[PDB]
Amino acid sequence: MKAVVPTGKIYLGSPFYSDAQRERAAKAKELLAKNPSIAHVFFPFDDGFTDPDEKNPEIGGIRSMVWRDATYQNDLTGISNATCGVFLYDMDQLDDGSAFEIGFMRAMHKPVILVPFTEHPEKEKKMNLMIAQGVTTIIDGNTEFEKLADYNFNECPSNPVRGYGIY
Amino acid sequence: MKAVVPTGKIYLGSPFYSDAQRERAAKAKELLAKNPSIAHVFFPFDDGFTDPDEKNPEIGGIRSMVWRDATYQNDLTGISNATCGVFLYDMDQLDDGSAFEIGFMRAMHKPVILVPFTEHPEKEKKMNLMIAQGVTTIIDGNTEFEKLADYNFNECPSNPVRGYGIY
Amino acid sequence: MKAVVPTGKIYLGSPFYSDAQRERAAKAKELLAKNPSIAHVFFPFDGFTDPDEKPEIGGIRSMVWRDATYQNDLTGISNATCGVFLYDMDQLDDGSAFEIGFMRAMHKPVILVPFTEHPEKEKKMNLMIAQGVTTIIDGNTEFEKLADYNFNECPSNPVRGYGIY
Amino acid sequence: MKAVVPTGKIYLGSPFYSDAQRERAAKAKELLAKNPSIAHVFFPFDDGFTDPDEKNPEIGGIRSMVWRDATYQNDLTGISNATCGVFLYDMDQLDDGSAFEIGFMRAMHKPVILVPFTEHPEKEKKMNLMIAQGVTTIIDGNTEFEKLADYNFNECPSNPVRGYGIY
Amino acid sequence: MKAVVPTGKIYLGSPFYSDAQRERAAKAKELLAKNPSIAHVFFPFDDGFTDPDEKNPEIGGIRSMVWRDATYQNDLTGISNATCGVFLYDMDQLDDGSAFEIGFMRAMHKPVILVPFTEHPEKEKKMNLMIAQGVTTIIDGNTEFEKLADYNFNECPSNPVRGYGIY
Amino acid sequence: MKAVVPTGKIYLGSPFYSDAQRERAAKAKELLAKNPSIAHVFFPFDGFTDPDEKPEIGGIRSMVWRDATYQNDLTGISNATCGVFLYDMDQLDDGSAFEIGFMRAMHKPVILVPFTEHPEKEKKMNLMIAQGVTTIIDGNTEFEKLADYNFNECPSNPVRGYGIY
Ligand SMILES: Brc1ncnc2nc[nH]c12
Ligand SMILES: Brc1ncnc2nc[nH]c12
Ligand SMILES: Brc1ncnc2nc[nH]c12
Ligand SMILES: Brc1ncnc2nc[nH]c12
Ligand SMILES: Brc1ncnc2nc[nH]c12
Ligand SMILES: Brc1ncnc2nc[nH]c12
16 A cells, blocks of 8 residues: 555666666666656766775776676675565566566565567567566556656556566 | 486577577487487477467567467476576577576576587687576587587586676 | 664565455554654555556466566565564465565564464464564554654564464 | 486374374374385474473463564474375364465475375365465375375375365 | 665664673664664664563573463564664674674675674784675674764665685 | 485585684585485585696685685585584684575474583573574484484474573
8 A cells, every 4th residue: 555655776777888778777766766656766887986906997898806706795785675676677688687687686585677679670589488477567667667756666566577588 | 516317407598599509409319319318308489389260470570479388387397397598599689588598597597508519610719698697518519519428417517607708 | 783874774564465465464554653763664555557458356367467566566675674563463465474474584583473363263473484484472462562663773572372283 | 217216205294183193194194104206204293302491381372572473483494304294184274374384385296196085975066276286296185095105205206186165 | 875864773682681792782772763864773672572471480590381472473573673783793702693683684685794802902813704794784783883873874885805815 | 204315405514724624524425425315415625626726725816716605505505305403602713604594594304413612601692503403413412313313305404502692
């Protein structure tokens, strides 16, 4: 029933390797900001750990084990504190980090909101069984991105993936 | 220390959408068969559930919810009974089902053996942080596929991913 | 130990088959509604609609509806910080029991609120329930405690006075 | 794949006390003892903890906290060690202990096999959604009780509950 | 991102009995009470369970099973409700209770903040690997105790233990 | 209940700093070696080598070595069906305690095998240890029980006779 205070703690998982992916993340935060059921949102790429012993760090480059552990754990920490996951899932370039986080969250029995995006709304609709069955709620990013602003994250109502070929 | 009987229960995760992926799986089973530390190996694509109410089933096609649940659960069942995971991980075509299973297994604190394969041993070596940090042991598929036959699955000795750019 | 804000997130599980059971549920919602340590309450029966289900209650239900409804409850269990169970000692609801075992396997606290209309029978309880529950509040004589119980910390209160089977 | 040594570790859950129920349990053991895939079977009612500090143990009595604690724990230990659960489920007199155990195992992602028994096959077939959905494989006690001797507990293939009204 | 309402639910673990230790705990509370990101703080020694059936409660005595059970459980409940753990860790007299609690929380994937205190800053700096690796963020009690008032418990950014010998 | 094959998978945790501690560990391995209910035993100190570490015991260790070694233990905890702890009551090993809490959060059984060289002091134990452990075998007077204990089912034996703090 109606909550006394916002309780949703969103773990916003998302690729961040292209302008389009980056714009979706931006857009997602905005909508989430308009949702009255949200108490907090964590985006893994917002802050960052800095390793002093790490001289001249580069992206996609070799990183120190210390930076790697700290950054990975901040993400797991985000998942731990989150009550649910929201994944801006690029269906054109499958992100394994996101897929990994979806499985982790489900192993913890946490609800997972999948928001698929494709630049080819007209190509075949197929999805991996693990993703298709692991997620508890699907919200198409192409045509319903906006309900993130209204979805009741206090209870995360289920909505099984349907309409996708399974492989 | 030395085990009285084999105790390793391997969950062999792997894409199965190309001849090359299919040959690796085949090869993997053979090596695993030669390993004295293995009590059992589960390959998700070996058996299969059959839904009677499912008329004319097709691969990649729309599947019944009953078949979807049963098949997904057989996989989770495999992960549950497994003591460790071994992933024939295609680095050229990232498989999200596999990535999902890697995260699930790690959320359960189970050791995960990553065996990466690439048809371009000469291209840049980069890996997602979640995969790079989530796996506990890496065995290159291109140059060490064969140690699967000797690895001590009774204890799954760690071997951190190194030599890969992190993104 | 004094919360800055209410944190208690209650999963209120109970059978919803008889009028009596529907009454208890009705009362609990109100009682918990007056507790200042509660941030939110979730009640399973407050549902999903399979647009493809041509559907009777108690009848054969589509797998899609079954999956979504079952998940909505587990999701309520996941979000909850504790469980409050309007537990029927006369008609044992295995669903409620399942959920109690699920929550405990998750290490979360479970407040057992038993009810009986047969005070005549020897008060007894299954071991798993007797030992699994962390806090018991008699529904026949302490129901009102739910409006005052501190769900921010859910103080323990082991089951006693019940014969074990 | 074929197991090198039996892998199934069964948690055999069942109500006792009722003459019929005891019979079921006894026959289940026999059936299981004949299954090559089973490595071990734990039945909670077999042996028990004796509280030396317990005067006159009343079976159904107001038993001491030490006995209760040790007995309850001996069951969780069995659930913990078990790879799968097999429940002799009485559809005539619902045993909440069993139900408890089923959800506990499912929260652990362990496979659960339901073997329902009814002395009233003429009565309506109904099942609580939590059981019907939580269970991973059903094997009708009244009709396929014998299957327990052939079921491959090394993989516990799933068989979704069906044909039951759901309330 | 910025939280809409305090999200941090702290499990404040610490040894008691020792005059110094009590002081630490008292100051930690003050510091925490000043942190805007904190929603609630649970300290195991604050209030307690009273076993009406317990004659003359001996603090350090052979306490009854009911008291023990209710007290131990009240702590797990706090760990369960908590989003993160903050441990006032005595490097001079290792408290195994605290250690227990740290591993329990890590098995749950919850973030753990170590605040080490030593009355002998001249002695060698060493730490048991399990603590040094299990801990997700360290905040020197002797030097940065005040940080507890600024630390964003809505996300618990990590800070790997370093500068300690490991045995 | 009679295993077809040994299933017990033991995670043997203990401090490995003093000669005495190194002796107990030595004995346990042998005792467990005679138990027919055991399929395998894992002992943390039996290690990893960071080819890039130029390394002293107790010294500063590379993060890579730290990560791999720590993981090897958690992996041993994951594979194990139960834990056997050669627990020192004179010099509390927080590593062992951490691992005990980890295993219990995983619902696995933990056999506490305490040892003391000071029978003179009031036998006491921390609550979390006293309540977390599921089976206790006195290392000073029952050490040998480990060769006969049934690890296929690890029968419970709550801690008693210890004052609680
Ligand atoms: Br992936 C990935 N890469 C780099 N920084 C990160 N933080 C969180 N997830 C990250
Ligand atoms: Br993916 C995927 N697709 C089809 N069948 C499967 N079984 C296990 N995993 C599977
Ligand atoms: Br149980 C159970 N049975 C039927 N419908 C439900 N909705 C929520 N929980 C339910
Ligand atoms: Br007695 C006894 N022994 C083992 N498991 C049980 N569940 C309920 N009562 C039980
Ligand atoms: Br007393 C008491 N109360 C709460 N937590 C504790 N840990 C050890 N002893 C404790
Ligand atoms: Br603890 C601990 N400390 C140092 N080395 C180890 N290897 C295994 N467990 C260890």
